[PDB]
Structures are given as C-alpha cells and as structure tokens.
Write a protein that binds this ligand. Structure first.
Ligand SMILES: CCCCCCCCC[C@@H]1NC[C@@H](O)[C@H](O)[C@H]1C(=O)O
Ligand SMILES: CCCCCCCCC[C@@H]1NC[C@@H](O)[C@H](O)[C@H]1C(=O)O
Lengths: 595, 583
C-alpha cells in the first residue's frame, strides 16, 4: 500500500516499543492449531523488543531454532474518535498480529514496515492483548531466499546462501499511533535543479476525502512557497540545495482538510538532483566520489535489533574516519539511519533483501533459474520487495541509488530473463534515481550478462584474498586489468562496493601475510593504488565497518572478520590508514591520480 | 649415528647467500667465499630467520659456507663429513673439490673426505641447498614460472615448506676399521636378540651389559646371539658393545637396544604380548623463529608437556623426526609410529593441475622409485630403535583414481621384506571411507583421520556422532583390523570463548574431543587415539588457515588451551596401556 512514517503533531504515538514482552517457542506447531491468541502465554519468559531473539538468552538451542515464535503484550489505549493504527516497523520474515482474538494483518517482508488500521477493534480506555506470531524460515520464494531442511526426526534446520546470520524476531519499533479521520496517508516529492540557481519541487499526495494545501517552510520556520492541489509543481529561488557536505533540509508541511476535521503532516525533503553521466555520478551537477563502508545491522546480544547508542556511536566513527557514504548492505536499514543520513548529508546506496541468488559460493538444486528454485513466484516476490523498499524510502534525499540484488550468479541462461523485467519495473516505479546490481566476483567483465540493464556498475572484488591468496604483485595486475575491461565494456561509473580482507584484531607479522593487520593495511593500500588510476572508478566502499556474525563454517572464525573495526567498535590498524586517506582528500572529489 | 672412544661442525654461524639469478653452480661460488653473504644459524630453517618476506618464500638455490679447523689428533684416521639433515637437496664441497650430494632432506648423508682434507689446517665447506619440489620429490609438488623469472612453488601438504639445514652437522673420525652397518632384532615369548654386523678387515666380538658394564650375555659372530632370561612405562635398555678387530687398530661401538617384539593379533596391537591403547599426539617439527630447526630446549619442554598431559605415544607426523627425538623416545619408553615424507599424493584436498593422480605426468616411475627410496632410508636409519613399533609408508593418499593399488602394492611388499619385525600401515584420508578405500588391506594396522563435525556436518555433534560411529563399526566389520585414529582435531583460537560452544571456540574443542572419545569407547577395534596436533604450527597461506593450523591442544609458544586439561584428566585417569571398558 502506501507508507508514511508517523510523526508527532496534532497526531499521536504510544510507543509500544516497550521491552519485556512474553516470548515462547512453538517446536511442535501447535500454536495455530491450539489457538494461542486466546489468552495466556503458556510457558513464556521475558524478552525485549526491539531485538533479535537468537542471542538474547545465551541458549544455542534457541538461536538455531527454525519455526514459529510467539510474542505477547498487554497494553492500554490512549489515542475516542481517531483512527488508531498498529504499526510494526520490522518483523523479520513473517509476522501475524492479533488484537484480542482477532486477526488484524500479516506480512512477509522481513525488513520493511507493515501496519494495520485497528480503530473498530479497540476501545480507548481498557486494556488489549497483542499476540505476534513470528516465523523465521526461508524458502525459495522469500527475499532473501533459502532452503529449510528437515531430517529423520522432523527437526528443522535452516540453510541459506548469504553470509550474515539469520537473526529474526521483532527488530524495530512496535507503535500504536493515532491520526484524524481525514489523513494524509501518501506523499511523493521529486526535485530538480539547473545550475544551483533555481528549480522546482513537484508535489503529489493521497488523502482521506480531504483537500491538500501545502506550504514549504524553512530551517527556521519561514514560508517560501505554497500550493493548492493534489499534484503540480512549485518553485523556490536561489535555493539552499542539499549537498553531501552539509545537507540542507526544507520542511514541506502538507495539509488535508475536510469540512470538519483536518490533518497536518510535516515532511522534510532537501533540494538535490542525482544523475549518471558517462562515467560520472553527479550530485547537484558535480562529479562525486564515494567513500565509506558496506555495514551491517549487527551487534552483540541484540543481533539485528535496533538501538540508538549504536547509531550515534557508529555515525561518530564514520564521521571521524572521513567516510561520506555507505550502502545499506543486503537488507533495508531502519528508517532512523536514513533520517540521520538525511540531516547529516550522508549519501546512501539503498538495497533490497535480495541476496544469495547464487549457488557457486561455497543438497543444492542444480539449475539456479528453474521452476524448482527461483521461479516466477520468486520474481513476483522480488518485485514486491522492490515496491515496498521504494515506497518507504522514495522521499529521502540521502538515497541516491536503488540496488535490486546482491551478487547473483548471472552465468546461467535465464538470469537475464529473471532480472530484466525487474529492471524495467523498478525504472517505471522510481524514475528519479539510478539503479544498480552489485556484481559477484566470478562474473567478471567477460562472462557477465546482466550489468547492461543498470546505470551504475557496482563491483565486489577480492583479488589477493580468495584468489591469488597472499599475492599483491599479481592481484594488482589482475584487479587493474579487469577494471579497465569493465571500463572498455560498459563505459559506466564503477563503484567498488566491497573490498576487504579478514583480520584477527591483534594478529601481527613481519612478513605481512594474510590475516594480519599489516596485510589488511598493505592490501587496502594496493587496492587504492589501482583505484586511483582508473578514470571510471567513481567510488570505493570497503567491505565492512565491523566484524559481524555469520553461520558456522570453516571460513568464518567467529563470524566474518573483514571489518575495519571489531564487533565492539574497536579500530584495527587499518582504520587509521583509512583515516589518513579519506580525511586527507578533498570532500566529494576523487584523488588527482595521486596525493 | 656417531659416537667415539669429534668436532661438531654445526657450532655458531655460517655464511648464507641467495642465488636469484641462478649463477652459483655456473660461476663456481663454492671455490670462493660467498660474495655478499649474511650470518645464518644452524640448525634452523632459513625462511623465518631474517623476518624478510622475500627470503621466507624464496624458491631456488641457497648457499651455506663455513671454514673449519680439522684437529691434529686425526692424522692417519679417515675423516668423514656428516650432514644429519639438509632439507630437500644438498651438494657439499670441501675446499675446491666436490664431495657429496643428496635429495633426501629429512635423513642424513655422509661422505669420506680423508684425501681432500689435511688435518691441521683450515678448510672451507660450501653447501648448496635446494627447496624445490616436483612430482618425483618426497613430498611431491610443482613449481611455476612467468615473466621476470619469479619462481613460485605449490605443494599439496598442509604444513609450510621450511628448508635449509635443519639438524646438526657432524665431522667424526673412526679408525681405518669401522662398523658401517649394524642390525639387531629382539624376540620375547610369553627370550633374546639376534645380532648382525658389516665391517672392513675386522672381526666381530659382541658383548652387552645392563646398568653399567655388567655384562649379562655375550657372543662372537655375525648371527645367533641368544642368552639369559623394555616396557612403555620406563624403558629398560641394554648396552650392546660391538667390536671390530684388525691387526693394528680396534673399533668399539655401543648400541643401546631394548628387548621387545611387536605384532598384530586380530584387532590387538601386542607389544611384548600385551594389548595396548595408544594415547598422545601427532606432532610436527615446527617452532617459533627457527622453522624446523632442531633444539634441545624444545625437546625437553615438549616432552615435559607430553609427560604431564598423560600421553604415552605419538607419531613422527609426515616426515622422519630428528633422531634425538627417537633416542629420548626409547630412553623414556614412548611408543613411536615412524613415518616417511610421503604426503600430498592427493588432488582432492582443495581450499574452497593434472587430470588424474596416477598418470605419467604425475606419480609414475621415478615417483614410485624415490618413494621406495625414502622407505629404504627411513628404515636404514631407524631400524634398531626399540621405541619404533610401527612403519608408516605414506600419509593421506588419494586412493580413488585408477592405478592407486598398482602403486601402493609393491611399496608394501618391499617394505615388508625389508623389516618384517614390525607392523606396517598407511594413514588414509577422510574422503576415502570403508566403502571406497582400496588399500587398507595391504597393511597390518589401519590408520584413520576423521573430522566429522568440522569439515562435514560442520558444528553438528548430534549427527557427527552417528556418522563417526557408523563409519567406525563399519570399518571394524569390514576389515576386522586394529584401527588407530591418528588424526582427530578441530581448529581453536587460543582466547576465543563462546557461550554457545560453537566452532573455533575452546568449548567446541572440548565438547568435540569428548564425543569422539565416547564413540571411541564404544568401539572394540579402536586400539588408540591421537589428537591431531600437539601445538599450532605454520602452514602455507590459505583462507582456511588463520596464521597457520590452529588444531593444536597447545599454542605455538606452548601454552595450553581449554582441552589440554580435559585430555590430561582423560589420559591419566585411565590405567596406563589400557582402554576403558566401554566407559
Ligand atoms: C568462484 C570464485 C569466487 C570468488 C569469491 C567470492 C567472494 C564473495 C565475497 C562475499 N560477498 C558478499 C558479502 O556479503 C560477503 O561478506 C563477502 C565475503 O565473504 O567476504
Ligand atoms: C570428506 C573429506 C572432507 C575434507 C577433509 C580434509 C581432511 C584433511 C586432513 C589434513 N591432513 C593433513 C594434516 O597435516 C592437516 O592438518 C589436516 C587438515 O585438514 O588440517
């Protein structure tokens, strides 16, 4: 449907985000049968929302549990005559909500919010019970996809194809918000600029039988433009347009009035224009250079759960290190991260949860794009995730790119058949932004067959790590050669969205061999040397802020160790190399082929 | 091995030089002092010694050199130069005259230098050491080159390819009647020990004592020697003086020997007619800073750790150890499975190339010959040791392609004919289970390497227990042979802890070593356990090695992980030489 983030005005929120819900497992799938919605928690225990249920009890048998978990919470209802709505900003994978024995709504998104209108079903003044059924399972039509395997005892074991651990549960806000019966439930805003001198910001919104008078107030509450109608444009003059450095943000207050009731919604948008020209990524008609991380929503104890201290601290670290950009790696991030990126002018490459469409990253199906794995319904679900992501992050000026999928195996015939309609559909959904598909390493420029449909070429390369293990002299030649081959092929702006190596924070060696910090430094350094002599490399993005948790494997030593920082946010030796490089260059500009 | 009744030339430092342009043999570098040399220490691998990244991985020709004074007291005696071990290949020159060469690596080679040496004046010694491996070296490998002539060596074993001079170099003197060859075989029923001898212009008079010069038998001849009437606890060993008499000079050579006879009966390993149970480690010749170089301090300390942790046996894993380890081994009476450098005969161990392992371009002809040679030398050096109870021809070979059996049968035959007094084995890899292995019948004891719960069924104890159990008792029902598990271990970061007891944590090494021990306890054919590696050790660079192999109970600087005390409780809590009665 339509997605508007709620905000306090003559509108109200009761943060049911309160922790300490009742939590229980359903190892027998008796919950849907035995009507657990009715009343009690049976044999529950205290859990905390937001937060992943896997790491929260230090029980291994819970963290690998694959099935149905039950959340439970009684709450009181203060808003009368207002539309009361129950919003879940994120319930990872599947969630079915119940308000006092009655199914309200359900979702199969994972990292996208879903809400429901509960005005008839509640009465402001008495209690009410909310029971959530959260499913953490992945089959071939989920985004991301997976394979759940039962064995001889019927015990479910979830296997997937991405790297990060499949943290599940309620990860973001659960809120009970309250809006007048004539609401402003959808908005779209597109901005243009000409020579940083003047241009318009077209408006568009959806009401509940009310008219929309829209004003454009300033950063100090000064009206600069008005407008009367459901559509149309409106022009500023000599704007304070949104730059990657500062990030100026106008406050467009929209009004939807009825003959009796009225609703006012303030929506912050910044004037900026993002486009791709040849091999240049232009923000406000200036060629840009991306620097920063591909991070994860990962932490100790809470898993993929959200928390504010992590936001302010992580943004302080990136702010110190000189990073100006990041990419919401492998799933839509919490909207709060994108609000911060909006105010602080942080350019973001947004991505969907489509990751793992690849069976070469080592009882696996034998054809990746057959009916037994990634079929038409996988394509429908992928288009769904695109729809929801764009419908949530469409107005945020910090998003400059949509990324449909991550590292798909494109060698087999049919990858183009699967991905081309999704490129067409995404271009038809949001024309204001470039589109991309992050490229796997074993699909170099001479075997890929998908990168033509996208505006920006994103690359994940690990020459010298997975291949040429320990060889810098050779990985330099290979890396430079394939980079110039991508240039000779597509003449596109090339952002390296992943490049990193594993490093035991504390492992040193005089020989600068793999897994030591000296190898991380020398490796990133050589990669930077190659980066500086390719004209079409419009951005670099290291593989990963900090070490994150992965599934158990013989390649993951307590998870992925390719982070610049540790899981507790401590810098390895390479963090200060990146400090020197990024903070030493001119902001938003590519190095002049050398310092 | 020399004694007397010498000047150990390995003292101090040698001149060391690299040959990147490969000019040495052509420009005759041995006939002069090494131009642009630097000090190097023997014994010790040259790779780790200088903290130089380029020196560590260098593949080519290296040059050692050292002047020495030949003592005046050796006027009319034969002067012999002995290299206890020069890893992979070595060509030795003595003062403008080429004396010797050897492609062994982990076994000694000596040469008579009496003419080329005049005792009293200083002579120079130049050694050319090669660290290259092709398909005819033991272990095998293959070198690759490109533009700029940069040579890059790739091999198929795990441990890092350390090279150089790894053990002492001796310069011993014997009278002109020497005892070049000696053999001794001991028997025991419910006995004695035949003697042997090879000499030049000298007769053989053999006597043997016990504690001190207290002869308790004698014999005059090159056969028989039987008379009056060695344990894994203490290790009682008699002293056998051999005498070679000539008209002018006489020679006396003392050889310690322990009375013992090893034999396999059904599914039991009998040392002195008693069922045994193997406990201990499969270790390595690896250390901080010195590579595979030998050192007495390390031997004393590691033997202290093995004594404390309750180990009674170990296997000289993947190459012949320094013979000092075996002298200590029969001194304190620790059971040793001796093994050749035959490792890496497998193309299936891929971190994630010819087309068939037993083709002509890889493993055929000189490969089989030189393997038989590594056998002949290992046996010709370690035959008399009572601590050696087992022969081990090869380790983890791929026996699935066509032609593996045709390869391994003749080696088993010749090796058995060479030393019939000891059982023989071949440690097979994990990818070849009971239904696919085709060689385990040729050998007396079957050796197993198993990693259920690590490489396959990664992190799942509940099923790896079943697979290990089924595979084990299926082996037992299949061949009805004694099965020693010679490798079972999992990697572990020394300081990584985890409440969930998942992989790489010490809790997972503890819980993973435990389940394997219960499945061990419910199987009658398992005649021993040897946790994979004693200490973490250096390997080649891969994405599966976090600064080497972390499958050690101890770290590289010999510091214990959480499993060291678990195993010290298990091995010393049971009775010595006995297996638990299924619990
Ligand atoms: C057959 C050739 C394979 C080439 C190597 C592919 C490496 C893919 C790297 C992986 N790319 C995806 C990212 O989420 C992971 O964290 C990253 C990693 O594992 O470090
Ligand atoms: C089904 C087989 C899956 C792969 C099993 C690989 C077992 C190889 C055993 C290897 N054997 C050689 C030894 O030096 C090494 O330490 C050990 C290892 O892995 O580290």
């Amino acid at each position: 449907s339509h997605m508007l983030r709620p905000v306090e005005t003559p509108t109200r929120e009761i943060k049911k985000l309160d922790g300490l819900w009742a939590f229980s497992l359903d190892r027998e799938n008796c919950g849907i049968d035995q009507r657990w919605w009715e009343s009690a928690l049976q044999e529950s225990r205290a859990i905390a929302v937001p937060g992943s249920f896997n790491d929260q009890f230090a029980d291994a048998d819970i963290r690998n549990y694959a099935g149905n978990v039950w959340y439970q919470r009684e709450v009181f209802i203060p808003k009368a005559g207002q539309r009361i709505v129950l919003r879940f900003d994120a319930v990872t994978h599947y969630g079915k909500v119940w308000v006092n024995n009655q199914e309200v709504m359900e979702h199969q998104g994972g990292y996208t919010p879903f809400e429901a209108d509960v005005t008839p079903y509640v009465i402001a003044g008495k209690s009410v019970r909310i029971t959530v059924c959260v499913n953490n399972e992945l089959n071939w039509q989920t985004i991301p996809p997976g394979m759940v395997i039962t064995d001889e005892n019927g015990k479910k074991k979830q296997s997937y194809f991405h790297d990060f651990f499949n943290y599940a549960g309620i990860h973001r806000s659960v809120m009970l918000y309250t809006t007048p019966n004539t609401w402003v439930d959808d908005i779209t805003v597109v901005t243009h600029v000409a020579q940083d001198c003047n241009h318009a910001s077209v408006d568009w919104q959806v009401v509940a039988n009310g008219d929309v008078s829209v004003e454009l107030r300033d950063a100090d509450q000064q009206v600069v433009a008005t407008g009367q109608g459901t559509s149309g444009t409106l022009q500023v003059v000599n704007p304070h347009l949104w730059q990657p450095g500062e990030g100026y943000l106008y406050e467009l207050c929209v009004t939807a009035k009825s003959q009796t009731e009225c609703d006012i919604y303030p929506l912050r948008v910044g004037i900026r224009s993002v486009a791709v020209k040849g091999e240049q990524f232009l923000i406000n008609h200036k060629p840009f250079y991306f620097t920063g991380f591909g991070r994860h929503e990962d932490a100790d104890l809470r898993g993929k759960g959200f928390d504010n201290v992590l936001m302010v601290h992580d943004h302080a670290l990136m702010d110190w290190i000189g990073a100006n950009s990041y990419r919401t790696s492998h799933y839509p991030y919490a909207e709060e991260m994108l609000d911060w990126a909006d105010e602080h002018g942080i350019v973001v490459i947004d991505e969907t949860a489509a990751v793992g469409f690849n069976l070469s990253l080592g009882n696996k199906p034998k054809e990746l794009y057959s009916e037994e794995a990634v079929n038409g319904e996988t394509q429908q679900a992928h288009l769904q995730a695109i729809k929801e992501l764009i419908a949530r992050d469409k107005n945020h000026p910090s998003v400059v790119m949509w990324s449909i999928a991550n590292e798909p195996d494109t060698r087999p015939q049919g990858a183009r058949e699967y991905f081309a309609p999704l490129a067409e559909a995404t271009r038809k959904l949001d024309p204001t932004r470039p589109i991309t598909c992050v490229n796997v390493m074993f699909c170099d420029a001479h075997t890929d067959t998908i990168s033509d449909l996208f505006d920006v070429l994103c690359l994940n390369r690990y020459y010298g790590w997975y291949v040429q293990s320990g060889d810098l002299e050779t990985a330099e030649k290979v890396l430079e050669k394939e980079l110039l081959a991508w240039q000779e092929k597509l003449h596109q702006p090339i952002i390296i969205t992943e490049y990193g190596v594993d490093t035991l924070a504390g492992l040193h060696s005089m020989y600068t061999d793999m897994w030591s910090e000296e190898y991380q430094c020398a490796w990133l350094d050589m990669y930077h040397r190659v980066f500086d002599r390719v004209s079409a490399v419009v951005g670099e993005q290291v593989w990963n802020f900090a070490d994150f948790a992965t599934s158990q494997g013989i390649l993951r030593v307590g998870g992925n160790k390719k982070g610049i920082f540790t899981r507790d946010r401590k810098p390895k030796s390479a963090a200060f190399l990146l400090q020197k490089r990024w903070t030493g260059m001119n902001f938003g500009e590519k190095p002049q082929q050398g310092g």
